[PDB]
């Protein structure tokens, strides 16, 4: 009894290490050891959202962008509240809870789920599609701007021209796009714990 607590924590830690290496196995272990009520998307999303700071963030991202994990991703992103935040501010919050994957297809799913959620959270007024393009363009800019492998960085005008016609058929106001651009340009999106 005087060891129950300490033993319980160790049980938890071993589950996490198992999750970090193999998401599915770790989750099964966590549900079996009673750390997660069930295997529903809702219970798993809540666990990931709340214990984010104890799990391997890259593993979380690879779990969430798994094409068969559509609902888990939707449930997870539903735990955020983006009301009244601008697109780049909301994306930074989203990306503090997991490590964004690197393949375009994986990034697309994340941005898709994020966009529809961000849009619904608002009910410059971009429709669902415009928020998607804009958000996708932000991930692009972060890579273009800080990935050492990139040779020639977009200038604001490049970023701006590239988005022509993406605002409900027309253009986003220049001051708006400049704010977003400068935001990413001067403050790279990174995982704080990593530095």
């Amino acid at each position: 009894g005087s060891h129950m607590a300490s033993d319980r924590k160790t049980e938890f830690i071993l589950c996490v290490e198992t999750f970090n290496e193999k998401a599915k196995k770790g989750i099964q272990m966590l549900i079996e050891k009673g750390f997660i009520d069930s295997d529903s998307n809702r219970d798993i999303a809540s666990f990931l959202f709340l214990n984010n700071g104890r799990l391997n963030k890259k593993t979380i991202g690879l779990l969430l962008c798994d094409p068969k994990k559509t609902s888990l991703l939707k449930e997870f992103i539903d735990l955020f509240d983006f009301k009244g935040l601008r697109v780049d501010e909301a994306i930074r919050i989203l990306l503090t809870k997991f490590r964004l994957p690197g393949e375009s297809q994986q990034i697309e799913r994340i941005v898709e789920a994020f966009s529809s959620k961000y849009s619904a959270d608002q009910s410059v007024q971009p429709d669902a599609d415009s928020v998607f393009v804009l958000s996708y363009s932000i991930i692009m800019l972060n890579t273009d701007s800080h990935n050492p492998q990139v040779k020639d960085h977009m200038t604001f005008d490049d970023y701006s021209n590239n988005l022509r016609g993406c605002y409900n058929g027309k253009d986003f106001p220049r001051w708006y796009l400049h704010k977003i651009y400068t935001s990413i340009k001067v403050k790279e999106i990174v995982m704080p714990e990593e530095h």
Binding site: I107, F132, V133, I139, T143, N147, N162, I189, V190
Partner: protein
């Protein structure tokens, strides 16, 4: 000078850039965002470009398609079931107004495999002979060993230079 390298998934784009790399293995923290696979060879910059992805995002490709002198199309010579899919992707890339004068290099990759279609057959399956205004070359290769990679890049270089 810029060159984009496209191809269906698993054609061997990553493998090819691995061999061409040789450079100091990434010992830095990965930048949040898209994977960037690029390399320099004879002052020419080659970059892998994923053509996958819903049409909604294509407008964001415009900036990167500007100033493109050449396209390298990588195709898995052993994947007979998806060869026609590959032809469609190539034809969609060549139709890009921004690549109208681009020089084309096709790497018929995975020639090391037993039942890999040869360069001649690939040339036929991809309809290369139907292209009425296009400078192109097809090179048999094996990305894992490096065979043909340089022979093809050297042909491409010589074509953009003069």
């Amino acid at each position: 000078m810029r060159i984009l390298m496209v191809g269906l998934d698993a054609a061997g784009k990553t493998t090819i850039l691995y061999k061409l790399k040789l450079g100091e293995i990434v010992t830095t923290i990965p930048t949040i965002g898209f994977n960037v696979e690029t390399v320099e060879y004879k002052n020419i910059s080659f970059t892998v470009w994923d053509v996958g992805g819903q049409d909604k995002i294509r407008p964001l490709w415009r900036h990167y398609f500007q100033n493109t002198q050449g396209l390298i199309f990588v195709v898995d010579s052993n994947d007979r079931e998806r060869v026609n899919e590959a032809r469609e992707e190539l034809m969609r890339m060549l139709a890009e107004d921004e690549l109208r004068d681009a020089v084309l290099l096709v790497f018929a990759n995975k020639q090391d495999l037993p039942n890999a279609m040869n360069a001649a057959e690939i040339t036929d399956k991809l309809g290369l002979h139907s292209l009425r205004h296009r400078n192109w070359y097809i090179q048999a290769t094996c990305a894992t060993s490096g065979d043909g990679l340089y022979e093809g890049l050297d042909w491409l270089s010589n074509q953009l230079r003069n």
